[PDB]
Amino acid sequence: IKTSMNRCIHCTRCVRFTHEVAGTSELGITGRGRDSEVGTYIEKLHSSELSGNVIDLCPVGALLSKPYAFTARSWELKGTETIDVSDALGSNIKVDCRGTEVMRITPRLNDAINEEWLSDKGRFQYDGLKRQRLNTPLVKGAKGLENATWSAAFDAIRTAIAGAKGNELKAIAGKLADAE
Amino acid sequence: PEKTTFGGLRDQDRIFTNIYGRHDPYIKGAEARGDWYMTKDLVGKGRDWIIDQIKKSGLRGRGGAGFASGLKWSFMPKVSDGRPSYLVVNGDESEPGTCKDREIMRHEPHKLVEGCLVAGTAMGARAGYIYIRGEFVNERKAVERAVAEAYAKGYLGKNACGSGVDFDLFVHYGAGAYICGEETALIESLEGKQGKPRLKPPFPAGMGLYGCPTTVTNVETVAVSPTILRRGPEWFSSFGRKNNAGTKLFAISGHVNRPVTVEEEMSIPLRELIERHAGGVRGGWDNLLAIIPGGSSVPLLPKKMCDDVIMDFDALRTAQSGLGTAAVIVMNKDTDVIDAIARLSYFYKHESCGQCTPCREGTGWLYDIMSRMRKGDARLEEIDMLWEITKQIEGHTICALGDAAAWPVQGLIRHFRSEMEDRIKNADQQ
Ligand SMILES: Cc1cc2nc3c(=O)[nH]c(=O)nc-3n(C[C@H](O)[C@H](O)[C@H](O)COP(=O)(O)O)c2cc1C
Ligand code: SF4
Ligand code: SF4
């Protein structure tokens, strides 16, 4: 969470969310009159895993996303409505992309599953979609895993499967594997 | 009490009798002055009888509203739905011109407690809370001693005063805020949160302290009620005019020969009050720039209006002002009206809780503009802009503190526009 409290109109959406929904009860309006201010009176960090939702709840940009800071403008982004595989809730999300890059992820309304809230992991895990990526088929040799074409990898898999028979072939599916 | 002329209240007609603290303010003196006299009978007569007698007396509410006390008390629920009823006495007396409630708390503690018993029985409230200003430590000590004494003699508690009624009284104190005098903000403060007013479409009679039906009434109304039930509603009705019947405590302050707190029948002429009880304006009646009639919230009145103005609710309404509290403030010709109204604007900028946008921002805007006008920095169009801003604030706020911030500035513009124009032009000229 990035803070610009000068831009803060004194609605109480962040405080009401932190109390009623998130339930960490960390934010409040301290002060009286014009110098009334919103935030933790002490130096505290927002602990809920629903912390990202205050950014969307904030109407006037006083609370903003630090990972998605000064990177793009709204009109530049193409939004595609998809679902979050972070957990089995299947939270409905809208992925905003510029070119070939995902820039930000925000929730969608589905009263059935995710009212309009998104967990922090799902919201901010797009950063790890640009790192440690696999781009090409790799076949092992004495020099290690090395670049290979699709045909060569399939040939190696064929030579390997030829040896195995029956239950010697074993499949382990991952957390993010799809039905197809 | 004569319909033609009102004034010159006699000692026999005064409710508050040790207002000046010449006698023992505690229980020994209180019983000898007529307090706690026959409270058994008045309470035993039933809540309905008390409500009808208060309604017939015509007692309007002290504290600024002026709303009829009997009707407000009759709005309380008759039968419990599982929720207790509460009586809260607003002894928070924050108002820039008002000192009247402090004398009652410190010199007549037992009248207030007896009134709390009577009104709680009238509204069917099991428990009562006397909210007092945190700054009023000694006055609170006096009230607490009165409560303890009343408990000791059985005037309060189960089978209070010998009648089959049950009432428990507590004394609670704030930490200093003008807003905590408002009905909902006081309830929020006593609940334990910040003293920020609640939107009124839910009304305190429906849901109040701890979510239960409550009524907030001023110390003066609660204190005057028991003697109204003793002396009689007709006696109370006789003194004032129509719709404005009772006597009220007038606190004269400012440039007067003797600043005094006094009890007088309503509908006394303001000139008569100032000249007889206050000793006259410092330098004579000729030496009047303006008079603030009802404390700082209400608009000020110029001398010309002060000539014929009568000390009443509806009449001050006709004179584009109000008798919120009988806190009359007198200014000499020497006084700079601009600076005093700017100080009131600073007061309201300091006392806004900040909950709603219009008060929180426009009151500081008003203070800044008034500060510039106090030096002549502003332009001539700034006055019209100031009127427009005051109109913007009024009516669009949660509570009446926005209205109370707008009104003094509007009165200054309306009656003393010439001096503001003079100051603005002269600074440019010189
Ligand atoms: C900003 C603000 C401050 C107030 N301060 C006081 C106060 O200090 N004392 C008081 O008796 N009423 C105060 N009032 C008026 C309250 O409404 C009060 O609790 C109520 O009018 C009492 O009703 P009554 O006239 O029947 O006694 C204030 C109102 C507002 C809007
Ligand atoms: S939600 Fe945003 S605008 Fe509203 S109080 Fe919180 S930070 Fe300020
Ligand atoms: S008008 Fe002023 S004091 Fe009243 S609720 Fe609004 S901001 Fe608070």
Residue B83's alpha-carbon distances to B89, B214, B276, in angstroms, are 20, 10, 51
Rounded alpha-carbon distances, angstroms, from residue B323 to B123, B166, B319: 27, 36, 11
For residues A28 and A15, the answer to whether their CB atoms sit within 8 Å is yes
Decide: B130 and B143 in contact? Cβ < 8 Å.
Answer: yes
* Cβ contact B61:B72 at 8 Å: yes
Nearest to A31 among B350, B354, B361 (CB): B354
Burial class (CB within 10 angstroms; exposed 0-12, middle 13-18, buried 19+) of B397: buried
Strand residues in B105-259 grouped as ranges (E): 127-132, 168-173, 214-218, 247-254
Instruction: Name the residue type at position A102.
Output: V
Beta bridge partners of A147: A138
Give distance in angstroms: CA of B115 to centre of ligand 1.
18
> Resolution of this PDB entry, in A?
3.1
Question: Using CA atoms, how far apart are residues B275 and A63, in angstroms rounded to an integer?
Answer: 61
CB B315 within 8 A of CB B268: no
Pocket lining: B353 vs ligand 3, CB cutoff 6 Å: yes
B270, B311 Cβ separation under 8 angstroms: yes
Tell me whether residues B349 and A10 touch, CB distance under 8 A. no
B162, B120 contact by CB (below 8 A): no
Q: Identify the nearest ligand to the CA of B90 by its number.
A: 1
Is B386 in contact with B341 (CB distance < 8 Å)? no
Integer Cα distance of A11 and A36 in angstroms: 12
- Beta strands at A92-98 and A78-83: parallel, antiparallel or unpaired: antiparallel
Choose among A83, A77, A5, A79: nearest CA to A38: A5
Question: Are the beta carbons of B285 and B271 closer than 8 angstroms?
Answer: yes
B357 to A34: CB separation less than 8 angstroms, yes or no: no
Residue of A nearest to B364 (CA): A34
Is B360 in CB contact (< 8 Å) with chain A? yes
| Rounded-to-integer distance, Cα A146 and Cα A143, Å | 8
DSSP label of B281: B
Q: Which residue has the tokens 């409550």?
A: B214
Tell me if B256 CB under 6 Å of ligand 3: no
Which pair of structure tokens corresponds to residue B237?
A: 């009705």
Alpha carbons within 13 angstroms on the beta-carbon side of residue B191 total 19
| Residues facing B14 on adjacent strands | none
Record the tokens describing residue A165, joined without a space. 């028979």
The atom of ligand 3 lying closest to the CA of A33 is: 7
Closest by CA to B86, choosing from B145, B162, B201, B172, is B172
The amino acid that residue A98 corresponds to is R
Distance (Å, whole) CA B323 – CA B317: 8
Distance CA B48, CA B50 (A): 5
B46 and B254 in contact (C-beta within 8 Å)? no
Q: Which of B360, B398, B399 to mutate to test the interface with A (most CBs of A within 10 A)?
A: B360
DSSP letter, residue B212: S
Instruction: Report the C-alpha gap between B90 and B181 in whole angstroms.
Output: 7
- From residue B403, alpha-carbon distances to A150, B203, B221, B336 in Å are 78, 20, 24, 23
Contact B373, B424 (CB under 8 A): yes
- Nearest by Cα to B246 from B220, B269, B218, B276: B220
- Quote the tokens at residue B73: 């008390």
**How far does B352 lie from chain A, in Å, by closest CA?**
5
User: Which residues, 6+ apart, have CB-to-CB distance to A133 below 8 Å?
Assistant: none
Complete edge-to-edge strand list for the sheet that includes strand B214-218: B168-173, B127-132, B86-91, B214-218
User: How many Cβ atoms from other residues are within 10 Å of residue B276's Cβ?
Assistant: 15
Q: Please tell me if residue B351 touches chain A, with a CB cutoff of 8 Å.
A: yes
Do the Cβ atoms of B143 and B112 come closer than 8 Å? Answer: yes
Whole-number Å distance between alpha carbons of B67 and B50: 17
Is there a contact between A33 and B350 if contact means CB atoms under 8 Å apart?
yes
Contact between A27 and A39 under an 8 Å Cβ cutoff? The reply is yes
Atom of ligand 2 nearest to the CA of A60: 3
For testing the chain B interface, which of A6, A27, A34 should be mutated: the one with the most B CBs within 10 Å? Answer: A34
CA pair distance B335, B56, nearest whole angstrom = 44
Dist CA B29 CA B14 (whole Å): 17
Q: DSSP characters for B307-364? A: HH-EESHHHHHHTT---SSSEEEEE-SSS-HHHHHHHHHHHHHHH----SHHHHHHHH
Instruction: Provide φ and ψ at A128, rounded to 5°.
Output: -80, 5
Instruction: State if residue B130 touches ligand 3 by the CB under 6 angstroms criterion.
Output: no
- Name the phi and psi angles at A21, rounded to 5: -95, -65
Paired tokens of A50: 């629903």
Can you say how many angstroms the Cα of residue B34 is from the centroid of all Cα atoms in its chain? 25
What values do phi and psi take at B131, rounded to 5? Answer: -75, 130
d(CA B253, CA B99): 9
Cα–Cα distance, B109 to B113 (Å, whole number): 7
Q: Which of B354, B357, B361 sits opposite A32 (nearest CB)?
A: B354
Output phi, psi for A64, to 5 deg. Answer: -135, 165
Amino acid identity, position B223: A
CB within 8 Å of B329: residues ≥ 6 apart: B97, B253, B254, B291, B292, B295, B296
Q: Two tokens at A114?
A: 């995710």
The candidate with the shortest Cα–Cα distance to B162, out of B41, B33, B48, B47, is: B41
Which ranges in B166-218 belong to alpha helices (H)?
Answer: 183-191
Contact A34 B352 (CB under 8 A): yes
Which uninterrupted H or E stretch holds B370? Answer: helix B357-375
Q: Looking at beta carbons, which residues of chain A come within 8 Å of B349?
A: 33-34
Q: What angle do CA B327, B306, B279 make, to 5 degrees?
A: 65
B342 touches chain A (CB under 8 A): no
Nearest to B217 by CA among B316, B119, B117, B294: B119
**Residues in CB range of B349: below 8 A, 6 or more apart:** A33, A34, B363, B364, B366, B367, B405
Asked if the C-beta of B159 comes within 8 angstroms of chain A's C-beta atoms, the answer is no
What phi and psi, each to the nearest 5 degrees, are found at residue A85? -95, 5
CB contact under 8 A, B357 and A10: yes
Residues of A with CB under 8 A from a CB of B: 9-10, 29, 31-36
Contacts of B82 (CB under 8 A, 6+ apart): none
CA-based nearest residue in chain A for residue B367: A34
Structure tokens at A89: 């809730």
**Residue A10 alpha carbon, nearest atom of ligand 2:** 5
Inter-helix orientation angle B401-415/B357-375, to 10°: 30
Give the integer Cα–Cα distance in Å for B403 and B219.
23
Cβ(A15)–Cβ(A58) below 8 Å: no
